[PDB]
Ligand binder design. Structure first.
Ligand SMILES: *C(=O)[C@H](CNC(=O)NS(=O)(=O)n1nc(-c2cc(O)c(O)cn2)n(C[C@@H](O)CO)c1=O)NC(=O)/C(=N\OC(C)(C)C(=O)[O-])c1csc(N)n1
Ligand SMILES: *C(=O)[C@H](CNC(=O)NS(=O)(=O)n1nc(-c2cc(O)c(O)cn2)n(C[C@@H](O)CO)c1=O)NC(=O)/C(=N\OC(C)(C)C(=O)[O-])c1csc(N)n1
Lengths: 600, 604
């Protein structure tokens, strides 16, 4: 009965095992196991006596690592039934009750082995085991064969989100419940998101060049496969090719076409000349990552991106988390950038501010001034370093005119804007008390940005992001049913009506301005999706340390981000519209494929 | 439903509380407590509306450290409160615990706990769950832990602890969460006799060795505890014939000359100074002393908590039933049980085990043995008096503990046969050396093992196993365990028959040699009791580092020990017959009072 995680389309995706207890009948216990316990302590004053009392505890004794009883310890530590354990393994387990942490074979293997051999010696002294049985047993290593009891192989970011969030708020007891957790995750959309992120980050990586082998002269057993990349040891280097040994022991051949892409990385803004020979790319004993084609007939040299990314997709009517990708791959890093990655949103904040200007009486057609402006020592400048004068409000938004934002921020006031940023889902202590907030200086989580944009997609309401649809107990009884705040209660085909944070006119006008952003500049990239219900805003922070895209239709809000964990420039040429927008495009195109137009 | 400990008369002596869970109805939860949990984490994605709906599923089961499951168990364990009596600061403290009940525990890490708690308090203020005034009041608040003791062991502490510590040793903490009713072999009357005998006997030794000065000087009185009818006090004034001391209740008492005049100063184990002529020679101001009241709290005297330790173990020789156990001067001074854990050298108390083998193969108590000098390599064993008696009968060499005779019998008996016999008598293989020094009592033993050994003499030559559980019942009164001990004599009362480890004649003749030791020898020790069914042997290790007495009747075997935890001399004049024998005498005299003669039987 483990904690089970299901998508919204009823796919079991994860199984989280907690406290384990597999009761056994005293008669089924191997006599050597009973003797191991009987020789575990120097004195007993309850011999025969301890043997009669052991039956009361043999299925409940806590033995470390969530194991209660002898059968649970055999399963957790060795992937064995009690009858499958060696004398050394029975002695190891019998050593644990006294202190399951001081003698744990995982935490303290030397002290555990010390304890185990002490017991083995006692078994010999008591004549429970022979010198041969003793000699064989003492020689034996720890031989732990621990089965992973946390199954998360289909959609790892989704499964982990449930486990880590339940454990964060309610502790380890949350997993011991045996509950069936029914999430809001769309399995189809989750697979799209995973693939879009992986492809998009590999696209960035390939254009930035070959960064060399991940290791040289190290054991191949020390590297793990993931994101369809297989650890390989370079064994031979030719003119146009190279031979390499896999983890199965086979030798593959990478031809020129599979490595010719390898222009050397110099810096974010420079790659060396196209390689002219295999020797400029690989050395023998180098550890490379390879990827086969669909057939497994050809292999190419690939690279795991150093850059990171994320994707978060929510339903704008209720805040349902439809797809979540926290990084390039869950094995690489368990950290979920959609929920834990604090970054500056850049110009993706501008729609929040421009909505306040619409709220206070302006329209998308209202004339605004794109001119120089100074506030103390601060002289905000546009990306292009040019000024356009009197332009309509919408031109200022689709062209990210910094001076206009700062001017609107003067007109509307910092406090009204900070209060508005909060109502859109941002954090009080993360929003500065100055005029730089108009440019997107606050620290945000991509999930908060999706919360914000949902307001445009749903008619001006604040929704709350949620991942649980319902929880059932092991016996199929519904014990929790999500009661989300709805923007539009009639749209569902009752309960909690979401608060209106913008006038309908303001969410509507902003949604149309954002659709214009897509039907012009970025834009010319996004309109490659043959759909007329899409709106969005690109963003780039100072020196391209972040590339963002936040966009929607009336049924789905997606926020994509690309950047390095330790903030570095992505490269001169790498605006939001270039690095993040492609991921957003592949996701939205496939996610929305075969659904009618859905607008505000 | 806690682990309950009962004596052999069905009287409750101890209660050990395990995992606690006091389920409450979500509606009964103060809204501020819900808000504390709601502000415990920075973000929630299940404002904080959905966490509020999901909290009902976990609010009674969340593990919150120190065996507390659910909010009501944490309120009870940490503060001795109901959820509704908790302050905003106490609700914030508890709400901080689920994430890591060890990293944020207020008992283990009060600094990291308070840091966490105030972080939550700040969040509650930011979210508008509490006001600036509620906030200010709450942050100002200390941890204020008021933890109720859930381990009640106030009647016979060494007995109660024996059950808890032994169950936890063999089966872990899960043994106490069982709600089980443990029916022990402990005789309540005999347990009280043993406790008193030990306390009195150790105080007798202590008083004759002199005043060793105050327990501490210039230390906080809150750091000291009352036990063994001794109360810690701080000297506040020093007069000519009297002094003033501040008690832990805040009262100031006066100790008159009669209550301190006994205080001859301790010079060393073998010397005490002259009788004090003034209160200033005994106490200083800020000195931490021990005071005792008489019948009624009208007068107080200066007492001293012994540095010396002791123990008493009493078993039934027919089945090994543990009737009385005292592990030290007092359980509240040291939780260590010297009867079960105190490894010491038995000295001359081992001699009857060796001399029984000589009788077994088949010498008699009258057989002539040689008390002359002996050398084995570089080792030259010498007798206590440093003199030799020549050819003497076996019984005289045993009574007089003639080391040379023991060593000589050890060659006649052989090391391995003796080591086997010692192991057969209840001793540990790895604790018995492989040399001729074992004849002198060099192995490391537990007093319980010595009682196991001596039971063999009392029961006719059978090996019994010491046991403390008679039966175990579950919380619903169902019997889940019923002790099936090995019996020396089944008609004397499954039934299980104990193995014979000695000829009846050898057990019978040794028991009679041991009776003569107490009756004709040891300055008429049985004539101090007034019984004819007692046998026993005194023991003293090198430099009086240990004082032992092992003795019996056909129905009770008692072993007493006196010595210092860090082995030091008890004094030149401090043999077994001096230190341990008086405790053994008070216990046996009272324990056996009004029971007919009970001696060993000879089955030839
Ligand atoms: C807002 O983000 C503001 C400057 N604006 C943008 O970079 N806006 S964008 O919407 O991200 N965006 N602009 C462009 C673009 C296109 C061009 O042709 C030229 O010449 C210039 N910019 N693109 C590319 C696509 O449209 C494809 O053509 C966009 O995606 N940002 C700032 O104020 C901050 N940094 O700005 C830098 C990067 C220095 C800049 O202006 O270049 C900023 C805000 S908060 C913070 N830490 N930094
Ligand atoms: C045995 O323990 C052995 C020497 N024998 C004893 O000490 N026997 S006794 O039974 O403990 N015991 N002896 C005496 C006694 C009385 C005297 O008048 C004189 O002169 C000497 N001894 N008493 C007095 C009582 O009858 C008064 O009521 C006894 O109780 N011990 C040893 O072999 C060890 N050390 O030897 C010395 C230091 C010489 C010693 O015992 O004094 C020894 C054995 S194991 C170890 N670590 N040391």
């Amino acid at each position: 009965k483990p904690l089970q995680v299901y998508t919204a389309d009823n796919q079991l995706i994860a199984e989280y095992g907690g406290k384990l207890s597999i009761p056994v009948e005293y008669k089924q216990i191997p006599p050597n196991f009973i003797h191991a316990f009987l020789a575990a302590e120097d004195s007993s004053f309850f011999n025969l006596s301890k043997e009669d009392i052991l039956s009361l505890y043999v299925n409940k004794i806590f033995l470390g690592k969530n194991a209660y009883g002898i059968a649970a310890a055999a399963k957790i530590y060795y992937n064995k039934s009690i009858n499958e354990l060696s004398i050394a393994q029975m002695a190891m387990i019998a050593g644990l009750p006294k202190a399951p942490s001081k003698y744990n074979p995982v935490v303290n293997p030397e002290r555990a082995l010390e304890r185990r051999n002490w017991i083995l010696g006692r078994m010999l002294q008591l004549g429970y085991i022979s010198q041969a049985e003793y000699q064989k047993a003492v020689a034996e290593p720890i031989n732990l064969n621990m089965p992973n009891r946390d199954l998360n192989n289909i959609h790892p970011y989704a499964g982990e989100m449930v486990r880590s969030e339940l454990v964060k708020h309610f502790g380890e007891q949350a997993i011991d419940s045996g509950y069936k957790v029914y999430t809001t995750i769309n399995a189809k959309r989750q697979a799209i998101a995973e693939k879009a992120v992986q492809d998009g980050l590999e696209a960035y990586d390939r254009r930035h060049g070959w960064r060399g082998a991940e290791a040289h002269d190290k054991p191949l057993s020390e590297f793990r496969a993931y994101a369809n990349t297989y650890p390989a040891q370079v064994t031979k280097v030719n003119s146009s090719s190279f031979e390499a040994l896999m983890q199965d022991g086979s030798t593959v051949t990478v031809q020129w076409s599979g490595m010719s892409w390898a222009r050397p990385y110099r810096n974010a803004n420079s790659v060396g000349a196209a390689p002219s020979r295999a020797s400029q790319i690989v050395k023998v004993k180098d550890i490379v990552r390879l990827r086969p084609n669909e057939a497994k007939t050809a292999w190419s040299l690939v690279q795991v991106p150093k850059v990171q990314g994320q994707l978060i997709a929510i339903n704008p009517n209720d805040g349902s988390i439809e797809a979540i990708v926290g990084g390039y791959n869950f094995y690489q890093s368990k950290f979920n950038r959609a929920l834990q990655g604090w970054r500056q949103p850049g110009s993706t904040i501008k729609p929040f501010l421009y909505a306040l200007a619409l709220e206070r009486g302006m329209t998308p057609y209202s004339m605004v001034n794109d001119s120089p402006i100074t506030i103390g020592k601060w002289t905000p400048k546009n990306s292009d370093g040019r000024y356009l004068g009197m332009i309509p409000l919408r031109r200022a938004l689709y062209l990210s005119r910094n001076t206009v934002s700062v001017r609107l921020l003067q007109t509307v006031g910092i406090e009204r804007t900070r209060q508005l940023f909060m109502d859109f889902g941002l954090q009080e202590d993360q929003i500065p008390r100055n005029y730089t907030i108009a440019l997107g200086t606050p620290q945000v989580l991509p999930i908060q940005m999706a919360t914000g944009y949902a307001t445009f997609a749903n008619g001006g309401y604040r929704v709350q992001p949620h991942f649980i649809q319902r929880i059932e107990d092991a016996y199929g009884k519904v014990i929790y049913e999500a009661k989300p705040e709805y923007a539009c209660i009639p749209c569902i085909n009752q309960y909690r009506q979401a608060q209106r944070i913008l006038k309908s006119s303001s969410a509507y006008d902003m949604a149309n301005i954002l659709r214009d952003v897509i039907e012009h500049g970025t834009g010319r990239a996004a309109l490659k999706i043959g759909r007329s219900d899409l709106g969005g805003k690109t963003g780039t922070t100072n020196d391209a340390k972040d590339a963002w895209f936040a966009g929607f239709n009336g049924k789905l809000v997606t926020v994509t981000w690309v950047g390095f964990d330790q903030p570095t420039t992505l490269g001169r040429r790498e605006y939001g519209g270039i690095a993040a927008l492609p991921i957003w495009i592949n996701f939205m195109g496939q996610a929305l494929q075969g659904t009618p137009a859905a607008w505000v």
